[PDB]
Write a protein that binds this DNA or RNA. Structure first.
Ligand SMILES: [Cl-]
Ligand SMILES: [Cl-]
Ligand SMILES: [Mg+2]
Ligand SMILES: [Mg+2]
Ligand SMILES: [Mg+2]
Ligand SMILES: [Mg+2]
Ligand SMILES: [Mg+2]
Ligand SMILES: [Mg+2]
Ligand SMILES: [Mg+2]
Ligand SMILES: [Mg+2]
Ligand code: NA
Ligand code: NA
Ligand code: NA
Ligand code: NA
Ligand code: NA
Ligand SMILES: [Sr+2]
Ligand SMILES: [Sr+2]
Ligand SMILES: [Sr+2]
Ligand SMILES: [Sr+2]
Ligand SMILES: [Sr+2]
Ligand SMILES: [Sr+2]
Ligand SMILES: [Sr+2]
Ligand SMILES: [Sr+2]
Lengths: 140, 160, 154, 186, 95
RNA sequence: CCUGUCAAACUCCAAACUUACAGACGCUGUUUGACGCGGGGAUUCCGGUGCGCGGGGU
RNA sequence: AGUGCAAGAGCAAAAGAUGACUUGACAGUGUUCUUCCCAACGAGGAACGCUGACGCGAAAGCGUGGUCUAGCGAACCAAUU
RNA sequence: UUAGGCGGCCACAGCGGUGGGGUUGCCUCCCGUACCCAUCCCGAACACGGAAGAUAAGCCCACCAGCGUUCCAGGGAGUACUGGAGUGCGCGAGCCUCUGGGAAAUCCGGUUCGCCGCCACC
């Protein structure tokens, strides 16, 4: 029961919302894998007329790449209570977001007969804090 | 202009403001009179003015009749008397006037009117048993300023 | 089985109404026909309602009328018991009248004109501007009421 | 859901099991659909026709009933998939079915996939199905050579329940040989 | 009318009731009709192709062959006979 | 929550009614040949009134 | 929401967005409806075919321009293939 | 259908909720990247390979009506509106009688937590 209910790391997205590049170099070194550019939509008065154009970059980390990054990333942050999403996620910061979920998330991410995860199986802020806190750090 | 020009319902419903522009503002100052903080069910007596013929009453008559009615209530029951009158109709019908002979005759917007079918309540005042004769008088003055004949009917009042 | 009698003329009458009367074999004012009570026939008399007088007649009244106003498909020939006996599947007028009411046959089916060309109502009718319920002579009638008219138009 | 004006998708659309847009283009051929579907452990192949109250499966085949002809190997792989199609294709020929179009449902048209393997099997069984040879896996991979060479990188047996150590694509040959044989109780 | 186009005054007839919104079921777009069969004509708002002139909505014609996948349906406009080219999507069997 | 009103270019609803096709009855046609087809000759393309439904206009 | 532009209508594993490839905005010839309800009338328009040649796709299939309804022009003469 | 595949109708099927179900069976979640294939970055997905584990998701089974929806009874209502008729009433706008039809909102109590087809299968 507890096994197919205990949380895990879905993905860790490290992103840098610049606004106009040279930043790809640092992410590749800190994360381990290749980064990806970030475009934008709608024209903005802050010199953003060119709709589709580089503004930032991101890296989605999964499995080891995710943990091996969090081991040396979480200590650099001071996790708070409010910094937690309703779905049991949290973002701190160069933004570093951690997507947390239970053992059967694929059901909602697959193509064939996909279904939305029930509220009961959806992770809680509390259950998230606990799982994370139960791994080399403090809450609140 | 005479009410003879706009009293009958002889034209299509013309209310769509998204297609009509330059509609004159309503002369009707208030729709909620007396004590608008108290409830209608807090009164023993409920008297309404009922229109006997289906017609169109212009906002000019609506204001004048509503005025001559409530002004009497204020005079007899004071500016803060224990009563509350209501004008439940709103001037939705936009009226024109062909003011070039019959050529391009579609008239320009000159006003608004409220359509009321026979048997409907134009006014409905709620008062106490004592002030019942004053509200009947206010309505008597009110029906003298609208096109149709009217009935002053008591909905809640076995106190006679 | 109902007895239809045109009481209002063709002039100003709606064409689709006039056509129905003609489909019911009635082409003149005061002409009568015997119509079975079927769904199809019911729709027809409902359409003609305002220009006609109808209802179920008594066996007696039907016999009086048949004897006096019925005719062969062709000719002057009086339709009496002897006539009925020699040309119809019945023994006398009564036998015919019974089958008609019981809706077992039709005038045409027995070699008789579908129309009973009646005489104007003796003493006059109750008026063609109002229905029976209002004192007029139009629309559906009581068996006694229809008899009064038909007998009056002997 | 929300109100009267609300529009709820078709049942097989809520369930996310039928691509209706693809289904139409598919039915336009007039030929029966060779419904190719998969499971984590098995592979199924149906020959479906259109009907007044629903579809009509004239001939089907499942990887489970593959063992009924001498298959001691797993059932979620390439040799399995191909053979299932061949079996279905044969049963189809028996029922009078002569042609069909490949319906892969919500699966991807990836080159050398199992749904294409299923297709190659049915075609080999004698069924006329619109196909493209260079989208089908190379003969050896169909046999399951990619798995034998994977077991070559042993140290630990690929298969848990003992079927064999180094695996046998030769078994594929043995089963194909069996099905193509005229006798066989289909 | 103010204009004399094909879709003039077709606001109601060529519009789906909210719940019939979205793509229509394929079953009826593939239905097969035989010559001589009586078929009701009614454009499916959701289906763009294979339509007939809106003026003909409500007709009940007779299938008399086909042109490609679409059907050739014979109807009588007033007193004039006409042959209508129409796909199954906008047709229904009578009775 | 409560309370007061509306829509020719609004509609969760929704007639009467009009309309396609078919069957039935009715009426009609097979010497009065209907339905339909082909050909000759027109006149006509200032209309009006009542009633119902309108749109404009006091 | 978006879908070039009135208005009304269509569209969600798309008819929208992104990306990529591509030139069917192809040649020839028709059927039918429309233009002109019924009911004759041209140019124009559309739907639906066939023949030829192609593009894309695993394939069914889609492409006879833009989701649909506006964006159009006789004879004579000239230029052009 | 002791959990499957393809469907028809396309909410009576939606939304929300409760309870129950899986040793070599099923569907899954699940384990995992040599290959086929894959990510403008991630075996996440797609694709391929496979069973240590699990029934917690999904799924299948049983059930609840609070919202939404379908249908039914009674009430509203033969009211509103209306096809046909009238030397019926009204200064009139308009109304009425007869004849043939006949709502909507809403109230109340029921119904509805899908039905059906083909194939496969202890
Ligand atoms: Cl599948
Ligand atoms: Cl057409
Ligand atoms: Mg004679
Ligand atoms: Mg006399
Ligand atoms: Mg008289
Ligand atoms: Mg309209
Ligand atoms: Mg010239
Ligand atoms: Mg030139
Ligand atoms: Mg459970
Ligand atoms: Mg009078
Ligand atoms: Na002038
Ligand atoms: Na639809
Ligand atoms: Na033309
Ligand atoms: Na880029
Ligand atoms: Na479960
Ligand atoms: Sr008028
Ligand atoms: Sr002048
Ligand atoms: Sr007065
Ligand atoms: Sr009409
Ligand atoms: Sr198009
Ligand atoms: Sr994995
Ligand atoms: Sr008068
Ligand atoms: Sr009734």
């Amino acid at each position: 029961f507890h096994e197919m209910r205990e949380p895990r790391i879905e993905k860790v997205v490290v992103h840098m919302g610049i606004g106009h590049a040279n930043a790809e170099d640092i992410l590749g070194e800190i994360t381990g894998q290749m980064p990806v550019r970030t475009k934008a939509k709608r024209t903005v008065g802050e010199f953003d007329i060119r709709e589709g154009d580089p503004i930032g970059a991101k890296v989605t980390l999964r499995d080891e790449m995710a943990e091996e990054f969090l081991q040396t990333a979480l200590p650099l942050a001071e996790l708070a209570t409010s910094q937690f999403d309703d779905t049991g996620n949290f973002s701190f910061g160069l933004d570093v977001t951690v997507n947390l979920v239970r053992p059967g998330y694929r059901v909602a991410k697959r193509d064939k007969a996909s279904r939305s995860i029930p509220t009961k199986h959806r992770l809680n802020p509390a259950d998230a804090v606990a799982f994370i806190e139960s791994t080399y750090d403090v809450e609140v | 202009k005479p009410a003879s020009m706009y009293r009958d319902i002889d034209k299509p419903a013309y209310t769509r403001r998204e297609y009509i522009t330059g509609i004159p503002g309503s002369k009707i100052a208030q729709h909620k009179m007396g004590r608008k903080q108290k409830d209608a069910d807090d009164y023993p007596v409920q008297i309404s003015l009922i229109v006997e013929e289906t017609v169109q009453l212009r906002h000019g008559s609506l204001e004048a009749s509503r005025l001559s009615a409530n002004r009497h209530l204020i005079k007899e029951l004071g500016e803060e008397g224990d009563y509350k009158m209501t004008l439940r109709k709103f001037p939705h019908q936009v009226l024109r006037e062909n003011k070039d002979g019959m050529r391009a005759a579609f008239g320009k917007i000159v006003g608004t009117a409220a359509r009321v079918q026979a048997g409907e309540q134009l006014f409905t005042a709620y008062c106490n048993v004592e002030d019942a004769e004053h509200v009947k008088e206010a309505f008597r003055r009110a029906y003298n300023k609208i096109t149709p004949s009217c009935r002053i009917k008591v909905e809640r009042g076995e106190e006679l | 089985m109902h007895a239809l009698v045109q009481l209002r003329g063709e002039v100003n009458m709606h064409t689709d109404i006039q056509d129905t009367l003609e489909m019911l074999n009635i082409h003149h004012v005061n002409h009568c026909t015997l119509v079975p009570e079927t769904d199809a026939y019911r729709g027809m008399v409902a359409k003609v309602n305002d220009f006609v007088a109808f209802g179920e007649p008594s066996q007696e009244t039907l016999e009086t009328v048949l004897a006096t106003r019925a005719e062969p498909l062709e000719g002057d020939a009086d339709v009496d018991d002897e006539w009925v006996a020699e040309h119809t599947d019945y023994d006398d007028i009564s036998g015919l009248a019974f089958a008609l009411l019981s809706e077992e046959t039709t005038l045409r089916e027995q070699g008789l004109s579908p129309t009973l060309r009646l005489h104007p109502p003796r003493g006059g009718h109750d008026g063609v501007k109002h229905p029976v319920k209002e004192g007029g002579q139009l629309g559906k009638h009581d068996t006694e009421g229809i008899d009064d008219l038909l007998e009056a138009m002997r | 859901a929300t109100g009267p004006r609300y529009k709820v998708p078709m049942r097989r659309r809520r369930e996310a099991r039928t691509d209706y847009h693809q289904r139409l283009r598919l039915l336009k051929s007039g030929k029966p659909r060779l419904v190719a579907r998969k499971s984590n452990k098995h592979v199924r192949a149906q020959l479906v026709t259109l009907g007044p109250n629903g579809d009509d499966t004239l001939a089907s085949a499942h990887s489970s009933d593959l063992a009924e002809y001498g298959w001691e190997a797993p059932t979620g792989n390439m040799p399995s998939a191909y053979l299932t199609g061949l079996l279905a294709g044969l049963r189809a020929q028996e029922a009078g079915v002569e042609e069909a179009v490949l319906d892969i449902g919500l699966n991807s048209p990836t080159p050398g996939s199992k749904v294409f393997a299923i297709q190659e099997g049915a075609i080999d069984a004698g069924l006329d199905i619109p196909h493209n040879d260079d989208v089908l896996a190379d003969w050896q991979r169909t046999r399951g050579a990619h798995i034998a060479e994977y077991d070559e990188q042993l140290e630990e047996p690929l298969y848990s329940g003992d079927f064999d150590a180094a695996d046998l694509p030769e078994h594929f040959d043995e089963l194909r040989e069996t099905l193509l044989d005229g006798d066989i109780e289909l | 009318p103010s204009s004399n186009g094909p879709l003039e005054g077709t606001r109601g007839k060529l519009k789906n009731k909210p719940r019939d919104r979205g793509t229509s079921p394929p079953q009826r777009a593939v239905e097969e009709f035989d010559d001589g069969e009586k078929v009701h004509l009614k454009i499916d708002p959701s289906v763009p192709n294979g339509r007939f002139h809106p003026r003909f909505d409500g007709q009940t014609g007779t299938v008399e062959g086909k042109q490609g996948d679409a059907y050739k349906v014979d109807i009588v406009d007033g007193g004039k006979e006409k042959t209508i080219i129409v796909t199954a999507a906008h047709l229904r069997r009578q009775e």
